Amino acid sequence: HKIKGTVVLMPKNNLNAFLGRSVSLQLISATKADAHGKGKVGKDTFLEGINTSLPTLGAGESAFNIHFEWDGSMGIPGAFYIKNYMQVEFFLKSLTLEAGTIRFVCNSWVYNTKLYKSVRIFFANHTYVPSETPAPLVEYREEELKSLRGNGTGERKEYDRIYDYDVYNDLGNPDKSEKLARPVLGGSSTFPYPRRGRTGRGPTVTDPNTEKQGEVFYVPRDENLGHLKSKDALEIGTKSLSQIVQPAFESAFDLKSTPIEFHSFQDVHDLYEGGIKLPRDVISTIIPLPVIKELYRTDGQHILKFPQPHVVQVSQSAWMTDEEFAREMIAGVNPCVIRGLEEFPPKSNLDPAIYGDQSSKITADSLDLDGYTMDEALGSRRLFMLDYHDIFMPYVRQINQLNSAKTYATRTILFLREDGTLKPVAIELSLPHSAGDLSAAVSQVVLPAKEGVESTIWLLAKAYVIVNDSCYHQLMSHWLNTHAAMEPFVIATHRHLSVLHPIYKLLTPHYRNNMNINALARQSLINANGILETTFLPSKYSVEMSSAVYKNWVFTDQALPADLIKRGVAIKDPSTPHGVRLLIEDYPYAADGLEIWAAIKTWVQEYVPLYYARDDDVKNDSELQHWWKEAVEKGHGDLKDKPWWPKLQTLEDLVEVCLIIIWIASALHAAVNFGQYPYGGLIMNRPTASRRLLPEKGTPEYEEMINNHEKAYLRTITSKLPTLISLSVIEILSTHASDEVYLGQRDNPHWTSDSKALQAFQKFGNKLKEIEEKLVRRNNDPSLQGNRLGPVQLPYTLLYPSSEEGLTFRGIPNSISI
Ligand SMILES: [Fe+3]
């Protein structure tokens, strides 16, 4: 008696070579055990032929027939070993055993057998907490986790599947130059930081504490996502941009083939209209590269044309309105920093002995609050702020010592008008002062103006605010809070939860591509002299600023309701559907976010009880306890002393932790990521850097504000060359790959055999579709036009769950995937 099987696999890039003695599988019993309690193993069984009968295959997949000698006396197969005797690795999709069908979802690269210390093992798609593991599989389950953890030593190789932690000691390049040395981020009280995936390349020659450079920054093999279409390999684009395209742009500027600076706002608009003319060999260098070639239209000879950013598709001037500047604090790229202001003037916690008197210079009587007194505005909860004063002030002196960087620590006061829109009413541009200061520049307050030199000064004040906001968005809202904060949970999950584990199945879709993009980011984006440092204001101080901010990162404050309450933009109200009442009722990010949050909460609350009947079932789950202990004490270990970490001894705590992880990875990351080119593709709307402070009266620079305000603005913000690079990187990051897996989707319909879990997941997907219809109605509601569309007429679609491929300004992926 033989069991009929079907193996589906994808060749690395003909089929008969998989036959003969190329690939053997051995079934492993879940129910019948050897003398040591381990499931019995069948004979080596080779692929016998190509199956061309199976109608649904697609995706460059091939199917192979196989028949296993297996008596009922051997029990029910629950796992299998596979050995690849071919030289080249293949991608194993699945095994299916017929006549209830048994399904194995594998989705794993299988390298040549000689490269593996122990044989590759795959489990059938049943789901078990550890106390429910069929005994003959208990040791196999634990051994496979031991294999995944490795031993904390060694240089990781491409085919390794070893998950472990290290500090961010791989960003500096001190062996190339002392100027490229960077502080180790993580593992000290000076610089706390999330851990990242261990690579083990070993030390630089000049510094035992910094990891040597490498051509490839390892990730565990199945974290390195293949793509059927090379245009979908968006993560490789930053590498190409830093390594190939950036030097090509630089040469064009070095040879004076294009003007060095923008001279008018039209020179910026030209980038997406007629394009920019570049040297032939510069176009030729750029035009044939995968991913990069999708970023620009070209004549193939001299022109690159960027796509028209969403923010200018209806009005190219509306970004400069005060209405849009404020609206983007609730519905823009970075909609999560604004806070309620409940006293006046705003206060600082910084030491005046270091920075000088920190009293705000904004006077209440100077403000136009539409007829409200300050006491009325405070009491009616109509006063808000965008407060970068205490965040930036500690870094202003060192940033301003750089050539071509000058910033202020900014604070913007906002008033919620009776019509429900925000209006900006003052900007404070603060500088530190200490006795021995060389600079005579002073802090100042700038108020709104529509005419004259005062309008130029106000427009520049908004630019200094948005340089602070862009830096905070890129480093903190985006990099720290999503990419970096998530990676420790990815590592802990593979180290401690078996593929069989229900919480592994719940969480892992929300990790797709995260370790991969992070490793590529450590190599080319956040490295010394990398893309971020060379395009953003803080230069070599950028990543360490994120460490300072991480000192105040609180896991439980990443929950959306807790975030809203903490920032004073909502109050707890148990008479409301979400348990919070928004203080800005039409706050598009928050109002749409609450819907997505509630949908995820329902899903987690339905899934958890399928596997855990009482609080103890959580207390007695050994993998779960080890997982969470390690995630906290190792992964986020610099904050292990903090009192706010959930303990994980109850059903409530398990739901909370899973809910927060899924929210960060899916909707939070989407809302801060997919608006980058749509809003920031016009550099004047989202400047990444500022290069000079406000000019003094009686100077040429002051006269230029009067006579050529667009040039004054362009000389203040990001220069043309870093603009071309920053626009290219945010274009890649704002694109959805065509093989994305969105919230409410999974990569395989058979991820579990548990029908109740599958039903709950279908309900979750239906609810997300229901939510999308509701968000469409919100965008179509003329009463919500001021905040959901603004004068840019850009419907807020960033939290629509679904999307087609491309630069769509919508769609919530499961994971931090770009
Ligand atoms: Fe991202």
Swiss-Prot record:
Transmembrane segments: none annotated. This is Seed linoleate 13S-lipoxygenase-1. The keyword Oxidoreductase applies. InterPro entries: LipOase (IPR000907), LipOase_C (IPR013819), LipOase_C_sf (IPR036226), LipOase_CS (IPR020834), LipOase_Fe_BS (IPR020833), LipOase_plant (IPR001246), Lipoxy_PLAT/LH2 (IPR042057), Lipoxygenase_dom_3 (IPR027433). Binds 1 Fe cation per subunit. Iron is tightly bound. Residues 11-124 form the PLAT domain. Changing residue 521 to T/V: Complete loss of activity. Residues 127-818 form the Lipoxygenase domain. It is an enzyme of class 1 (oxidoreductase). Its cofactor is Fe cation. SMART domains: LH2. It comes from Glycine max (Soybean). PROSITE patterns: LIPOXYGENASE_1, LIPOXYGENASE_2, LIPOXYGENASE_3, PLAT. It catalyses: (9Z,12Z)-octadecadienoate + O2 = (13S)-hydroperoxy-(9Z,11E)-octadecadienoate; (9Z,12Z,15Z)-octadecatrienoate + O2 = (13S)-hydroperoxy-(9Z,11E,15Z)-octadecatrienoate; (4Z,7Z,10Z,13Z,16Z,19Z)-docosahexaenoate + O2 = (17S)-hydroperoxy-(4Z,7Z,10Z,13Z,15E,19Z)-docosahexaenoate; (4Z,7Z,10Z,13Z,16Z)-docosapentaenoate + O2 = (17S)-hydroperoxy-(4Z,7Z,10Z,13Z,15E)-docosapentaenoate. PANTHER family: LIPOXYGENASE (PTHR11771). Its main location: cytoplasm.
